Amino acid sequence: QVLKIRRPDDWHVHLRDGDMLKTVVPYTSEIYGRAIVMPNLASPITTVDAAIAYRQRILDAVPAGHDFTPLMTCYLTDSLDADELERGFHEGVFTAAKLYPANATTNSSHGVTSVDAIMPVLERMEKLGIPLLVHGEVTHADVDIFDREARFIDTVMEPLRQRLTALKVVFEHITTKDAAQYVRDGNDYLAATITPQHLMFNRNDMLVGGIRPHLYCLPILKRNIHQQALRELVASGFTRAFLGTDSAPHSRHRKETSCGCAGCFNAPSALGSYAAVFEEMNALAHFEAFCSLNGPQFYGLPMNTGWVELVRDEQQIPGNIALADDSLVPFLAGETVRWSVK
């Protein structure tokens, strides 16, 4: 069987920089028309000039013939000038801005201390129509890791949305039934992205019969009941949830070690993985919208013009993707997948 869809987009991806970038860009560019490129580089993307330079590094690494456009984001920080974000948006450089968890001790050039501290930039985004992408977790030491997303909803997301009622918000990589229900019952200004790992697995898959660092990502995999809620949300054809891989590559040496980094390198296997989930939920009819229509509609962008075909032909995901000095282990490395791109 063949599954033909309009060329999809990836509404949440990390392309890194330098040699990493050169290696990972092709996995996104071959398949996706556009991708929302997250801004969390060593020196975060907090200026139009840096965004332009990063965009060109990305373009330099796209293989010949890939019809790919990187959509850049601004990393919100306490010290960010609202005029810088405005300038970048007005010039087509910034498509959106990303809010990472607040911490009172974060350096002002590297993050936000509180939503209060950046209300002027948020208000400017509301004025201009700039989408706010949110990593919705509280990161206070006394909050259990598994409760961080639910806590954010109540302490940060709801009060923020109640104030900036015309602000477009994407609740990124949702992982709980709490978020699924909040987004489901929300208004037209609220959307969400969902990763392939949060649909395919739960915390047992990461911790039962051994510990699996390649399944370790943030927000952390939750209880089976949460996974079930996310699968049911996409299976329903809900129009405000769309594809965001959160492909977040780290070298093998940084994953398989005493303190492993959070992040699943899923760009090489994500699309076929989502196809598998939709098939298992008897929801293939809703697959195209999730991958290729819902995100564009929410962002006010046109759907892609070309097509991508997936075939139910069993292929094996490589165990390793070579980098210059180390390697990347892809999501589902070594496994035989049911759907592959034609």
Residues that bind a copy of itself (CB under 8 A): 1-2, 4, 6, 78-79, 102-103, 110, 113, 116-117, 141-142, 144-146, 202-204, 207-214, 216, 220, 223-224, 256-262, 285, 288, 307, 309, 329, 333
Could you say whether residue 149 binds Zn ion (CB under 5 A)? no
Nearest distance from C-beta of residue 173 to Zn ion, angstroms: 6
Q: Is 14 annotated as a binding residue?
A: yes
Between residues 34 and 286, which has the closer beta carbon with respect to a copy of itself? Answer: 286
Q: Give the one entry of a copy of itself, Zn ion, none that residue 324 binds, where binding means its C-beta sits below a cut-off of 5 to 8 angstroms depending on kind.
A: none
Q: Strand 2-6 vs strand 307-311: parallel, antiparallel, or unpaired?
A: antiparallel
The CA distance from 333 to 339, in Å, is 15
Q: Is 204 annotated as a binding residue?
A: no
- Cβ(303)–Cβ(20) below 8 Å: no
Catalytic option among 142, 246, 313, 326: 246
The CA distance from 152 to 121, in Å, is 20
What's the Cα-to-Cα distance from 17 to each of 95, 193, 247, 256, rounded to whole Å? Answer: 19, 23, 14, 21
Residue choice 98, 246, 273, 332 for contact with Zn ion (CB under 5 A): 246
Q: Is 231 annotated as a binding residue?
A: no
- Cβ(307)–Cβ(5) below 8 Å: yes
The CA distance from 199 to 245, in Å, is 11
Between residues 202 and 273, which has the closer beta carbon with respect to a copy of itself? Answer: 202
**Residue 246 is among the residues annotated as catalytic for this protein:** yes
- Token couple for 162: 């109640």
Could you say whether residue 126 binds Zn ion (CB under 5 A)? no
Residue choice 6, 135, 168, 240 for contact with Zn ion (CB under 5 A): 135
Q: Give the one entry of Zn ion, a copy of itself, none that residue 312 binds, where binding means its C-beta sits below a cut-off of 5 to 8 angstroms depending on kind.
A: none
Q: Strand 307-311 vs strand 327-328: parallel, antiparallel, or unpaired?
A: unpaired
Region from 1-9, 154-162, 240-248, 299-307 binding Zn ion, contact rule CB under 5 A: 240-248
Q: Which residues contact 232 (CB under 8 A, 6 or more apart)?
A: 180, 281
Q: Is 199 annotated as a binding residue?
A: no
Helix (H) or strand (E) holding 113: none
- Token couple for 190: 């609220």
Q: Is 246 annotated as a binding residue?
A: yes
Q: Is 179 annotated as a binding residue?
A: no
Q: Give the one entry of Zn ion, a copy of itself, none that residue 160 binds, where binding means its C-beta sits below a cut-off of 5 to 8 angstroms depending on kind.
A: none
Peptide bond preceding 219 in cis form (omega within 30 of 0): yes
Q: Give the one entry of Zn ion, a copy of itself, none that residue 246 binds, where binding means its C-beta sits below a cut-off of 5 to 8 angstroms depending on kind.
A: Zn ion
- Token couple for 179: 């978020």
The CA distance from 303 to 136, in Å, is 27
Q: Give the one entry of a copy of itself, Zn ion, none that residue 260 binds, where binding means its C-beta sits below a cut-off of 5 to 8 angstroms depending on kind.
A: a copy of itself
Q: Give the one entry of a copy of itself, Zn ion, none that residue 236 binds, where binding means its C-beta sits below a cut-off of 5 to 8 angstroms depending on kind.
A: none
Between residues 38 and 200, which has the closer beta carbon with respect to Zn ion? Answer: 38
- Cβ(303)–Cβ(6) below 8 Å: yes
What's phi and psi for 282, nearest 5 deg? 55, 40
Q: Is 135 annotated as a binding residue?
A: yes
DSSP 16-36: -SHHHHHHHHHHHHTT-SEEE
Between residues 57 and 110, which has the closer beta carbon with respect to a copy of itself? Answer: 110
Partners of 195 in the β-ladder: none
Binding-site members for Zn(2+) are: 12, 14, 98, 135, 173, 246
Give the binding site for Zn ion (CB under 5 A).
38, 135, 246
Active site residues: 246
Binding-site members for substrate are: 14-16, 40, 135, 218, 250, 262
Binding-site members are: 12, 14-16, 40, 98, 135, 173, 218, 246, 250, 262
